Amino acid sequence: QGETHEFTAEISQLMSLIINTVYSNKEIFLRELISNASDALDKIRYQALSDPSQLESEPELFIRIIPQKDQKVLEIRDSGIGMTKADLVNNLGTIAKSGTKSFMEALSAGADVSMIGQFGVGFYSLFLVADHVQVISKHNDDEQYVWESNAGGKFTVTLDETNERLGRGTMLRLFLKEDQLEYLEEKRIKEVVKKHSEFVAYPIQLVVTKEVEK
Ligand SMILES: Nc1ncnc2c1ncn2[C@@H]1O[C@H](COP(=O)(O)OP(=O)(O)O)[C@@H](O)[C@H]1O
Numbered sequence: 001q002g003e004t005h006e007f008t009a010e011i012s013q014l015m016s017l018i019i020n021t022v023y024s025n026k027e028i029f030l031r032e033l034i035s036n037a038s039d040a041l042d043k044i045r046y047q048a049l050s051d052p053s054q055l056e057s058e059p060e061l062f063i064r065i066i067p068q069k070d071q072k073v074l075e076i077r078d079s080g081i082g083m084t085k086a087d088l089v090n091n092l093g094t095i096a097k098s099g100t101k102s103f104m105e106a107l108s109a110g111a112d113v114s115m116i117g118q119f120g121v122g123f124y125s126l127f128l129v130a131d132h133v134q135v136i137s138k139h140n141d142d143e144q145y146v147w148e149s150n151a152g153g154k155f156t157v158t159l160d161e162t163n164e165r166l167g168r169g170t171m172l173r174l175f176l177k178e179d180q181l182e183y184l185e186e187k188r189i190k191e192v193v194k195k196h197s198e199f200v201a202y203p204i205q206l207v208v209t210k211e212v213e214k
């Protein structure tokens with residue numbers, strides 16, 4: 001119900017750095033988000049090894065990429081463990097993350113932005129290509145929620161009464177920058193996935209919309 005939270009100073013600082021950088025290899029955002037999806041799938045698989053009923057909320061383990069061309073949105077969905085409301089608030093903005101200042105110091109020293117994941121803040125690489133993001137998430141322990149950020153110093157968390165039910169897992173909705181619309185294209189997405197996400201334990205599904213003609 002429109003709960004507003006403030007990003008910690010260090011994350012606000014990181015977001016500003018990333019959204020404005022002219023780094024040349026922006027495509028690594030997709031590697032980082034697929035890695036987060038894979039990690040979340042690892043966690044529900046771990047739980048399911050001891051308690052198989054944890055999968056009943058969504059029996060299939062998958063990563064799914066859904067371009068929304070008309071909206072200029074790229075969706076990245078997983079059926080991983082998901083995040084409760086408290087997880088969203090805690091894990092995506094309010095708690096000091098170990099590595100945030102270290103990564104910013106590495107950047108000042110010449111580090112390549114692709115190293116962002118090694119510092120535990122790979123999620124924020126999405127701001128290389130998007131200026132607005134929604135994170136829709138459903139954990140077995142909670143209702144479905146939407147976390148939302150406009151790249152500023154605040155984010156919101158709201159009970160989800162407007163998006164498709166996930167069953168279980170997380171969907172990132174990336175509102176792409178106007179010069180980054182190549183990541184809506186089937187050919188481009190395939191290229192980036194095959195280059196940077198060759199070794200993933202779960203199927204990576206690409207949803208493509210084609211007209212029926214002739
Ligand atoms: N798809 C997802 N499903 C579940 N949790 C996620 C997802 N993406 C991000 N998270 C949460 O956000 C945190 C921050 O992610 P990130 O900045 O990439 O750092 P790291 O992956 O190194 O923890 C993760 O540790 C996790 O708790």
Ligand SMILES: [Mg+2]
Pocket residue numbers: 032035036117120121122123
């Ligand atoms: Mg990560």
Ligand SMILES: [Mg+2]
Pocket residue numbers: 140141
């Ligand atoms: Mg549970």
